[PDB]
Design a protein around this nucleic acid. Sequence first.
RNA 1: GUUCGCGAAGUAACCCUUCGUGGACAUUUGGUCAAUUUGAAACAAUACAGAGAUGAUCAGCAGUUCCCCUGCAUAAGGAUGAACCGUUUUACAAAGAGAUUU
Length: 41
Amino acid sequence: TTSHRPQLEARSGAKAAAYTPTGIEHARLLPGHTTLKYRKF
RNA sequence: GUUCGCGAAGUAACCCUUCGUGGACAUUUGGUCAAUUUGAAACAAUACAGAGAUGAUCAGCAGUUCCCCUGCAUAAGGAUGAACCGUUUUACAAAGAGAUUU
Ligand SMILES: [K+]
Ligand SMILES: [K+]
Ligand SMILES: [K+]
């Protein structure tokens, strides 16, 4: 059977760059650690 | 409509009452959209068949895809979700030999 295959190339992000996205709100993307820390001097 | 001012009629004259007249106040809603067949939802129903790696029965996890579905979801599930299984000819040259032709 040929359904079991090694990867010839990985799926590129350029394909998704052209897609029109949806407005789903992900739990991990909710506001958190909203302020950046900076070093002295 | 209200109110400020003016003409007038009524009244003995004011108040008050009416007809006329000027100014002030208040100033542009709503539709991406019409009410059954012809601008688009799907399941279901009838039939047949009964799931990959196998001699046999099965757990799977992935990858690739201009297939996605369920789910709050970057989780998980959907037959390992499904499809995958076919078709495949030239960067075409070098050395040499024996036959063909003037
Ligand atoms: K079966
Ligand atoms: K399985
Ligand atoms: K699965």
